[PDB]
């Protein structure tokens, strides 16, 4: 029996859509990943143990002799000593700090753990922070709301096998986030010809004209969506809807109003 590398996965201030995205993986599927490639040693959404049995599983993984990698989903609520986000009676910021200390590497799955995410959007009532900010350490960011499983599983496999991938200024692997959404968009020839839909009901919209006039953030958003698709079938612009910019830091405040460019 060859030892599989240990992965500890934490959920903080999150919607679980990142965990859901992760299990949409098909190269490999999630069962093959966790039976053959990694040892997923703590994962609240799917683990059998609950309560103190689950907390013990976490502590056993953190003390494992072969070490472990840390995946973090969700931002960290810091108001009131971190008490607005707790697990097993401990503030999320305290547990994440402890788990991060000994980690062989830290992967932030999603815009919330990478950058703060939806709970950090103004006026940020919980004083939410991204993981790097909260902990004061570099993180490998896999953003998107949620990221493509291709990007997250690809990053995980890359870290385990090849090394830490080249990151951009926002911590994102260039393998997946190196190109603008817009540069790979099938509607680009419409953009180039100034062929824009003025509304969703318009004939231009029906003909699949560019969505820039309807707020599309593709030209300022780094992600691989048109190249790889979601669920092997679609992506938002193909479904007739502008890109929200959801892999960009603080997009909730920098990319709104979503249906305009102003």
């Amino acid at each position: 029996a060859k030892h599989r590398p240990s992965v500890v996965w934490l959920h903080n201030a999150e919607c679980t859509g990142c965990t859901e995205a992760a299990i949409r993986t098909i190269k490999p599927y999630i069962d093959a990943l966790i039976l053959d490639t990694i040892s997923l040693d703590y994962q609240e959404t799917i683990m059998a143990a609950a309560g103190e049995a689950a907390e013990a599983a976490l502590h056993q993984a953190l003390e494992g002799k072969d070490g472990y990698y840390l995946v973090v989903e969700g931002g960290l609520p810091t108001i009131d000593g971190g008490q607005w986000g707790m697990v097993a009676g401990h503030p999320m910021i305290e547990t994440t700090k402890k788990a991060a200390a000994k980690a062989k590497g830290i992967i932030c799955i999603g815009t919330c753990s990478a950058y703060g995410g939806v709970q950090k959007a103004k006026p940020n009532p919980s004083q939410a922070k991204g993981v790097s900010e909260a902990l004061g350490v570099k993180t490998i960011n896999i953003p998107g709301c949620p990221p493509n499983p291709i990007n997250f599983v690809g990053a995980v496999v890359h870290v385990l096998t090849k090394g830490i991938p080249d990151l951009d200024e926002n911590g994102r692997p260039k393998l997946f986030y190196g190109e603008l959404v817009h540069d790979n968009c099938p509607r680009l020839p419409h953009f180039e010809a100034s062929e824009f839909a003025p509304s969703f009901d318009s004939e231009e919209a029906k003909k699949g004209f560019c969505l820039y006039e309807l707020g599309c953030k593709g030209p300022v958003t780094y992600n691989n969506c048109p190249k790889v698709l979601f669920n092997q079938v679609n992506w938002p612009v193909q479904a007739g809807h502008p890109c929200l910019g959801c892999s960009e830091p603080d997009f909730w405040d920098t990319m709104t109003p979503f249906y305009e460019q102003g």
């Binding site: 859509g17 859901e20 599927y29 040892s39 799917i46 697990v87 919209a205 479904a239 979503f258």
Partner: protein, 544 residues
């Protein structure tokens, strides 16, 4: 008899795993049975606060992130709510597309819940290693349609994979499972454990297909991106090839629901018949879903094919109409400022104020939604009782099949067993309707591909968006002023089910359901998990 210890004392389970979000359950146990209970939600994010002052068009994008398990549903509720507020009636094609996406979501959500969240409370996975795969195949052949996945060869393959994994000493997600070393509350033969484990693995693959179907119409899963004020954006979703692919994937998923999910559910139910007497509540509410007329919330309530209604005191003889004016939320036992009790959601207030862990006066970040003062269970069991009571012919037929197969009266459905069974029942019925709904939209779209209506943002207005999401009655309520969000309030099905006590100190549905729970082993309180999980809790949804 049902295994029961003599334990007297407190039990706390935190984290509750195999749910969405962060839940602490506290119970008091006397002589092996739960005598009192508290449902304590442990994270606040504050989407309603965040939404203030923003463009109403943006709401659906923020509210969709209330939760990624019931992805879509909040974008739908927000779109319905803004539609109501601007007084736009969406085109027929957009009603059809939105409802199909909801259907696809029910199929994905329920399948993942039963196999990946709930089944580990009932199935001892390590006992599957003791099974004779020849005997398992024989049993599978008698209890379910013939399929190659159920052959001795296929079940032996699963067992060998499982054995290699367990023998590695790295048990991963099964580490410190409540079933390790055996447990009196786990009743299944090893053969049944093996069959269920084989399907758990297959379900991991099938849910990918369910999401792909959903994405053909929704743009991507999780977090769809095809809805707009006044309808949908996805013209491609009305066309021939995409719809053929959608139908093909939906049929594969439905085949799995009918071959694996329903037969596994019934098999499990048959061994745990005692759970038909544990975990019951009394009041049920639904706003309905799958409406033929979505031009207004009134028409939604009236024309929902999974009908709307209110049941009180288990009285199936009296289904009342939903009074939207009678809904309010309390905060007396919640982490919000005193002063906020009794608010209708158009007047809703979200003023967070934490005290301390386990404060019996304030112990949850969920508000307490009440209906003329009563707590209401929402979700598949609510929908099933309401539909059955109204004589909805699909629900009548499927419910009677289940009751016949289990040899139990309908009154046994007011329980955790019933709550679990109802989730399967309605999944089979969604499946039965998929092709009709797809053909309807295929034809409507061929006719005229209008998908979005024209509309104008009013200076001042209000509106409500209703939906029955996989977990139950969901409503979003907006006040618009100066063409911006002045108030935006979510009241979510897990808020109804898993919220704390209301202003009169009256337990929520989960807190009531937990009373009387036997505890065979206080160190490994699987029975608490069984009932909590039967509600399919979503704490990110419930608190937002």
């Amino acid at each position: 008899p049902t295994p029961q210890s003599t334990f007297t004392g407190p039990i706390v389970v935190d984290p509750i795993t195999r749910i969405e979000g962060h839940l602490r359950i506290m119970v008091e146990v006397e002589n092996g049975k739960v005598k009192d209970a508290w449902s304590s939600s442990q994270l606040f994010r504050g989407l309603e606060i965040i939404l203030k002052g923003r463009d109403p068009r943006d709401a659906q994008h923020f509210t969709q992130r209330a939760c990624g398990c019931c992805t879509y549903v909040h974008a739908l509720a927000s779109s319905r709510c803004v539609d109501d507020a601007v007084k736009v009636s969406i085109p027929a094609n957009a009603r059809m597309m939105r409802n199909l996406v909801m259907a696809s979501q029910y199929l994905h959500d329920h399948l993942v819940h039963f196999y990946h969240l709930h089944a580990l409370d009932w199935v001892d996975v390590t006992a599957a290693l003791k099974a004779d795969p020849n005997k398992a195949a024989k049993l599978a052949a008698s209890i379910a349609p013939a399929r190659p996945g159920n052959s001795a060869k296929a079940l032996k393959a699963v067992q060998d994979k499982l054995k290699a994994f367990v023998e590695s000493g790295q048990l991963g997600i099964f580490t410190n499972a409540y079933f390790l070393g055996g447990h009196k509350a786990y009743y299944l033969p090893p053969e049944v454990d093996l069959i269920a484990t084989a399907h758990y693995l297959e379900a991991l693959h099938m849910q990918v297909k369910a999401a792909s179907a959903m994405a053909i119409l929704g743009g991507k899963n999780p977090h769809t991106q095809f809805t707009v004020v006044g309808g949908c954006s996805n013209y491609q979703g009305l066309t021939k090839d995409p719809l053929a692919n959608y139908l093909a994937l939906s049929k594969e998923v439905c085949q799995f629901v009918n071959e694996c999910y329903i037969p596994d559910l019934l098999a499990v139910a048959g061994f745990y018949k005692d759970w038909g007497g544990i975990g019951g509540t009394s009041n049920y509410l639904a706003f309905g879903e799958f409406a033929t007329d979505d031009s207004s919330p009134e028409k939604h309530l009236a024309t929902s094919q999974f009908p709307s209604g209110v049941i009180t005191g288990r009285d199936l003889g009296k289904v009342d109409n939903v009074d939207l004016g009678a809904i309010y939320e309390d905060v007396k036992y919640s982490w919000y400022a005193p002063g906020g009790d009794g608010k209708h959601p158009y007047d809703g207030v979200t003023d967070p104020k934490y005290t301390k862990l386990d404060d019996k006066d304030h112990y949850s970040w969920m508000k307490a939604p009440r209906y003329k003062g009563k707590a209401m269970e929402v979700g598949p069991l609510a929908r099933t009782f309401i539909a059955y009571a109204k004589g909805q012919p699909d629900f009548k037929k499927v419910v009677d099949m289940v009751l016949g197969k289990l040899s139990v009266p309908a009154t046994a459905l007011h329980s955790t067993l019933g709550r679990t069974a109802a989730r399967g029942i309605e999944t089979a019925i969604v499946c039965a309707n998929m092709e009709k709904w797809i053909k309807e939209m295929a034809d409507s779209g061929a006719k005229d591909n209008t998908l979005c209506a024209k509309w104008e943002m009013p200076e001042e207005s209000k509106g409500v968006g209703l939906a029955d999401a996989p977990r139950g009655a969901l409503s979003h309520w907006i006040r618009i002023k100066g063409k911006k969000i002045d108030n935006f309030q979510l009241v979510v099905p897990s808020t109804w089910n898993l919220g704390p006590r209301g202003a009169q100190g009256d337990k929520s549905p989960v807190e009531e359901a937990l009373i009387g729970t036997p505890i065979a082993d206080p160190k490994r309180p699987v029975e608490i998990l069984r009932t909590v999980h039967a509600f399919d809790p979503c704490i990110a949804c419930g608190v937002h």
